[PDB]
Design an enzyme around this catalytic site. Sequence first.
Site: not given
Ligand SMILES: *C(=O)N1C[C@H](NOS(=O)(=O)O)CC[C@H]1C(N)=O
Length: 263
Positions: A44, A142
């Site tokens: 993210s 992805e």
């Molecule tokens: C980002 O890595 N993602 C978005 C979300 N969590 O936000 S975080 O990155 O601020 O912790 C879910 C996990 C992850 C995703 N699988 O998209």
Amino acid sequence: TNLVAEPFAKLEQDFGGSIGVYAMDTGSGATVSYRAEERFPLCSSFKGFLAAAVLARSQQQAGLLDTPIRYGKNALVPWSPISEKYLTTGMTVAELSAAAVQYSDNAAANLLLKELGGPAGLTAFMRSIGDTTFRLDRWELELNSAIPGDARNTSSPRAVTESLQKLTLGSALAAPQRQQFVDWLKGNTTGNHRIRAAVPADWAVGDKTGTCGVYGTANDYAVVWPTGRAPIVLAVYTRAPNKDDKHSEAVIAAAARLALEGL
Ligand SMILES: *C(=O)N1C[C@H](NOS(=O)(=O)O)CC[C@H]1C(N)=O
């Protein structure tokens, strides 16, 4: 030998993987570096740079940030808590950018990627500010696969910190856009257990987190304003060799503490 590095090596050994750290005091030029030029998955954390790339475009495209985006259900993907609430009203480009940065909203990130010409458009923006390390070639979800030895959708702690400094403190954005990027990062809601847990409570922090989760992969980068001092820029990235290896917010906070102690 490297005595500064030994506490980082012990931390990553206890964690059961690899930790990458780069911190720079923008006043003195003092640095702390551990695996600083190794690649780690972005997860993210690419969404901060995405928001900056949208702000850069907004300088030349009058009213871009004010433009309403009226998306349908087909734009929604898992972990889009802000986007789920505006299917009939929509969100402005500014609101989508805030959601991507502050809630890590996945649908908002994909809508903004579309604006830029996809992951290739974001990678081209990063090249335009002098970042040769950043690579993104997938959309949500992805881009989160984080397979060991896959250089796609990665950067280094050092290149992340260098680009973060250019966009938040340097001249890569015009001042009104720089200020908006800083304000989005300051308002992040997802980082309370990472770099923010390492900084004295009175210090201002802007950060963006990443959590692939698989292969012990998670990260945080931040601009930190110690009271009465020049800002610190830093990045902490993790990964681990087994798919079921768990990420640790505690290890990210611990690595950030050693970085601040080492400056
Ligand atoms: C980002 O890595 N993602 C978005 C979300 N969590 O936000 S975080 O990155 O601020 O912790 C879910 C996990 C992850 C995703 N699988 O998209």
